[PDB]
Amino acid sequence: LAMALKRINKELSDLARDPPAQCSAGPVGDDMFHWQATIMGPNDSPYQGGVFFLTIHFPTDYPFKPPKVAFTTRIYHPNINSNGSISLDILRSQWSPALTISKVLLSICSLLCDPNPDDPLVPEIARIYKTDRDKYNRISREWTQKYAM
Amino acid sequence: DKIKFKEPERCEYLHIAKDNKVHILLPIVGGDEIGLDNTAETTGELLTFFYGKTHGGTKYSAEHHLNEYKKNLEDDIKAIGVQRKISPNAYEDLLKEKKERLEQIEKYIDLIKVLKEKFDEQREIDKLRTEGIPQLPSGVKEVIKSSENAFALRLSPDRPDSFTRFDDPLFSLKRNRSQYEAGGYQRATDGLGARLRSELLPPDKDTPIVFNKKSLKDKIVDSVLVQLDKDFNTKDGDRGQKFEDIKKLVLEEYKKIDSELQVDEDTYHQPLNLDYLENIACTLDDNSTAKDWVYGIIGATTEADYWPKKKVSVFYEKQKEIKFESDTNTMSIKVQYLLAEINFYCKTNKLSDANFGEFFDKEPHATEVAKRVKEGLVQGAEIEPIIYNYINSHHAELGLTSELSSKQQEEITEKFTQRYHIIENSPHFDEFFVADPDKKGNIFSHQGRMSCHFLDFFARQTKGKYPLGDLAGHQEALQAGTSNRLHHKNEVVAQGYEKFDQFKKEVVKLL
C-alpha cells in the first residue's frame, strides 16, 4: 500500500511546484487517498467565470487503476450528471499509469469547452445541445451563475 | 413358553467368548483407546472393582455383580428344570450352556477372595481403599510394563501434578517441579516444554500472537528477501542490474505458486524495470528499501483482486491467536501430545523402540521445534507436517530406519485428533494411557474401560503360586480372537430374543 502512497505524493509535489493556471487539486486531512480538485470553466464557454469542485478518490492499487473523479458542484453539461459522475474514457477504459491526475483535470476542462453529445450520460440535455445551442448556453450559463459563483 | 430368564445380557467386567468362556476383565482406567483417568484419580476403577462403594456411592464391586450373576443363573436353571417337567427336551443346550457359565463364575469368585485373603500381605489391593493416592498394584504395573499394544505417555504441562501413576512412560518430557514436591513449583530452564513456553508466550497483555499475519504475497516477499546478502542495497553500484537480480528471484517464486504469472510486463504490457517504476508508475525511488522493490514488482505485475482468491488442524480451533498465558500452555500441550502420538504409532508399528520426547528435549531440537511451530502459527501453516518433517529429517537419531509415508502421517494426524478431542477437557494433562485395540496385546477395550484379564493380573499378583485350575486356559483363549475390542453385550447369552422385538415394534410402526 505504500506503492501508491509514494505515487500520489509524487503527483502532489508535481502539481504543487507547477500548477495548471485553470486547475488545482490536493488532499484533505492527513488522508492522501481522498483529494479535492477545482476546475474553473474556460473563457470561451458558458461555464466561463464559474468555479467547479470535484472529489478525486484514489484506489489502493493506483496507478494500476484509474481514480474516481466526480463533480461536487452542479453543472448543466451533457457528460456529467446529478450523481456528479463524469463520463470520460480515461477514467473508465483508457486509463494508464503514464496518466496524471492533472491530465484528467485537463481532459475534464476540454469536455466543458468541447462537449461530446454522442456519449450522453444525460440524454435530455444532449437533445438540447444538438437542437438549440442558444437554449443550451443560456441554461448552462444560468447554472454556472447559480451553483458555481 | 419362552421363560422370562433373569441372566443379564450385560454384566460389569464380564466378556463371553464365541466358545462360552467367561472372561472377567480387570479395569485399569476408563476409556476406549485413551485413558480418561490419570494422576491421583488413576486407581478409581480398581478401587471400585475390588471394594465397590465403600467410598462414595453408586457403583458395585465385581464379587457383588458376579454373585448376582451367579444367583440369576441359579434361578434360570430351576425355571428351565420346572419347564422340562411339562416338556422333557425343553431348553436342552441353554441349560448346559448356563451351567457351564455358572461353574466359571464360581471359580472367578473364588479367585478374587483368595487374592484378598491370602495374597494381600503387602496390602497393594487393600490400599486402594485406605490410602489417599493409591499406587497401581504391582501386578497391574507388570501387565502394563509388558504390554505390546498399550503405553503410558507423559507430558510437561506448565503446572505439573507430581502424583503421576503410570511408571514406565514410553514417551516423556522433562517436567517442571510440582507444587506438591519438595521446594514447590519451579519452571525448568531447559527442555521442550520450556522453549515452547518462551517461544509461544506472548510479550505482553496488549500484544498477542495472531495466526494469519501473512498474505500469500507477504510470504513470497519474505522468501525473496532471505536470498539477498546480509549487506545488500538499493542505492550502491549498478541499480538497474540489482533490480534485474531481484526480478529473477521474484520470478522464481512465481513458478512455485502459479504458471500464468509473469514479470516482463506490468498489467499494461509495457517494459518493467527500475527506470519504468522509478519514473513512469512512480511507485519506487531513492528511499525505497529492497522490500519495496519486491512489492513494487508484485504490484506492477499482478492485479490486486487475484491475491485474495488464493480440514482444520487441532491447533486452530476458533482461536485466531494466543492472547493469554493459558492459551500458550494449551498450544504447547498440543504440540507435545502430537509428539507423543507420533512416538506411539512408531512404537506400536514396530518402527522404533525410542522415547522420542527424550530427543526433543535436546539443545538444538527443542528450540527449533518451538520456533518452527511459532512460525507456522503466524503463517497459518498446518502445524502437523512441520513436526512430521522434523522427525523425518532426523529419523535415524529417533531410532527409525526410514521416514514416514504420507499415508503414515495422515493416520497419525487422524488418531492424534480423535484422541486429543477425547481428552481435551481433562483437569490434568500430566500423563495418558493409550492403547491400540487393533493389535496383538494384553490390553482390551470393554464397556469403556481399558482392561487387563482378571486372570493375567491374578497370575502376576500371585507370582504363579495359587493355581488356576479350569480357568488356566482362558487368558490365552481370549488372545486368540479376531480383536481386542470386546462387544459390550454378550451375544451368546442374549441370544437374539431382543432382535426379534426390535422387529415386532417396527411392524407396529407400519400402523
Numbering used by the authors:
A (entry chain B): -1 to 147
B (entry chain A): 6 to 315, 323 to 523
From the reporting publication:
The Legionella effector protein SidC and its paralog SdcA have been shown to be required for the recruitment of ER proteins and ubiquitin signals to the LCV during an infection. Our previous work has further shown that the SidC and SdcA are bona fide Ub E3 ligases. Although SidC has no sequence or structural homology to any other E3s, the catalytic SNL domain of SidC contains two lobes, a smaller INS lobe that mediates the binding with E2 and a larger main lobe that carries the catalytic cysteine. To gain insight into the molecular basis of the ubiquitination reaction catalyzed by SidC/SdcA, we determined crystal structures of two SidC/SdcA complexes: a binary complex of the SNL domain of SdcA with the E2 UbcH5C and a ternary complex of the SNL domain of SidC with the E2 UbcH7 covalently linked to ubiquitin (UbcH7~Ub).
The crystals diffracted to 3.0 Å and the structure of the binary complex was solved using molecular replacement using our previously determined SidC (a.a.1–542) structure as the search model. The SNL domain of SdcA, which shares about 72% sequence homology to SidC, has a bilobed structure containing a large main lobe where the catalytic cysteine (C45) resides and a smaller inserted lobe (INS lobe). We have previously shown that the SNL domain of wild type SidC forms a complex with E2~Ub, but SidC lacking the INS lobe fails to do so. In agreement with this observation, the binary complex structure reveals that the INS lobe indeed mediates direct binding with the E2, UbcH5C. The overall structure of the complex has an elongated arch-like shape. Strikingly, the catalytic cysteine of UbcH5C (C85) is about 80 Å away from the catalytic C45 of the SNL domain. This structural feature indicates that a drastic conformational rearrangement is required for the INS lobe to bring the two catalytic cysteines within attacking distance for efficient Ub transfer between the E2 and the E3. A comparison of the SdcA-UbcH5C interface with that observed in the SidC-UbcH7~Ub complex reveals common structural determinants for E2 recognition. Both SdcA and SidC apply a similar surface area of about 950 Å2 on the INS lobe to bind a region around the conserved E2 loop4 phenylalanine (UbcH5C F62 and UbcH7 F63), which is the pivotal residue mediating the binding with HECT E3s. In SdcA, this hydrophobic pocket is lined with residues I285, A286, and Y273. In the SdcA-UbcH5C complex, residues K4 and K63 of UbcH5C form salt bridges with SdcA residues D287 and D305. Moreover, the R5 side chain of UbcH5C H-bonds with the main chain carbonyl group of A286 of SdcA.
